[PDB]
Amino acid sequence: ADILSEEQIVDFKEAFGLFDKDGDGCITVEELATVIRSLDQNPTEEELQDMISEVDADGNGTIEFDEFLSLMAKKVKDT
Numbered sequence: 392a393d394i395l396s397e398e399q400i401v402d403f404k405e406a407f408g409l410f411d412k413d414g415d416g417c418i419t420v421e422e423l424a425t426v427i428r429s430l431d432q433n434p435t436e437e438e439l440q441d442m443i444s445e446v447d448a449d450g451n452g453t454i455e456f457d458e459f460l461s462l463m464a465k466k467v468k469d470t
């Protein structure tokens with residue numbers, strides 16, 4: 392069920408990969424801004440930092456799959 396069948400991961404991984412238009416494996420604040428910008432929203436660095444920091448467990452200025460998945464699942468943990 393939740394083994395070889397990667398449905399949830401694909402969705403998250405698909406959203407993450409799409410965000411990483413560069414495919415470098417990580418989305419930088421500038422790159423994230425581009426994604427958020429498209430979503431009809433564009434917060435200031437501050438909000439981006441506070442939002443990124445809120446999840447950036449390591450605080451590197453970038454978002455990884457685990458971090459991205461947590462941020463999404465963290466805001467949609469309801470499911």
Ligand SMILES: [Ca+2]
Binds near residue numbers: 417
């Ligand atoms: Ca990137």
Ligand SMILES: [Ca+2]
Binds near residue numbers: 449450452453455
């Ligand atoms: Ca990070």
